Amino acid sequence: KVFGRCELAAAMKRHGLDNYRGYSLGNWVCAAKFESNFNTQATNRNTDGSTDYGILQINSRWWCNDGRTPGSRNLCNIPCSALLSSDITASVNCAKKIVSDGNGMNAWVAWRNRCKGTDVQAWIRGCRL
Ligand SMILES: [Cl-]
Ligand SMILES: [Cl-]
Ligand SMILES: [Cl-]
Ligand SMILES: [Cl-]
Ligand code: NA
Ligand code: NA
Ligand code: NA
């Protein structure tokens, strides 16, 4: 599913991501924009052999099981395919664990490089929330 911007903002809010770990909703929408362009089916293979999955490009080395990332963990206790669903619940639940791991949203390199420090409220501007 390719979410609209405000559609995704609303879904993220409903699932408790707004202000989670102190990160306002616009931070999460911005991260999803630059990780996946709001496409739940996004995947990307990394040089290390891990793969990133879903709207927030959650990586198989630590967070989900894909059966093809040797030596990896599955800290969200989920198949990586669950992160590709039109239903964002699994991605939200796993993102909550990731952002709680110590480095906040810097876990998402694209958030650090493209969202952090910017006017992230623009990502929710105009949305009925
Ligand atoms: Cl957009
Ligand atoms: Cl915001
Ligand atoms: Cl594996
Ligand atoms: Cl933080
Ligand atoms: Na990408
Ligand atoms: Na892929
Ligand atoms: Na790629």
Q: Cα 9 from chain centroid?
A: 12
Ramachandran sector of residue 2 (left: φ over 0; alpha: ψ -120 to 50; beta: rest): beta
Q: How many helices (H) and strands (E) does the chain have?
A: 4, 3
CB 72 within 8 A of CB 60: yes
For tokens 């599913």, name the residue: 1
The token duo for 73 is 């963990």
- What separation in Å is there between the alpha carbon of 5 and the centre of ligand 7? 22
Q: What is the DSSP letter of 17?
A: -
Q: Which of 7, 48, 52, 119 is catalytic?
A: 52
Ligand closest to 124 (CA) is 2
Nearest one of 36, 34, 40, 43 to 11, comparing CA atoms: 40
Report how many domains make up the chain: 1
Resolution (A): 0.9
Sequence-separated (6 or more) residues with CB below 8 Å from residue 13 = 25, 129
- What separation in Å is there between the alpha carbon of 72 and the centre of ligand 4? 25
What CATH number has the domain bearing residue 71?
1.10.530.10
Task: Please say whether the dihedral angle defined by the alpha carbons of residues 94, 99, 103 and 108, taken in this order, is positive or negative.
Answer: positive
Q: Which of 18, 35, 87, 119 is catalytic?
A: 35
Distance CA 29, CA 100 (A): 18
- The parent domain of residue 27 ranges over 1-129
Concatenate the DSSP letters of all residues of 32-93 into one string: HHHHHTTBTT-EEE-TTS-EEETTTTEETTTT-B-S-STT---TT-SBGGGGGSSSTHHHHH
Distance CA 63, CA 50 (A): 11
Is 101 annotated among the ligand-binding residues?
A: yes
Sequence-separated (6 or more) residues with CB below 8 Å from residue 11 = 3, 88
Establish whether 87 is a catalytic residue.
Answer: no
Distance CA 107, CA 98 (A): 7
Establish whether 35 is a catalytic residue.
Answer: yes
Nearest one of 38, 19, 8, 34 to 124, comparing CA atoms: 8
Method: X-ray
Query: Would you call 36 helix, strand, or coil by DSSP?
Result: helix
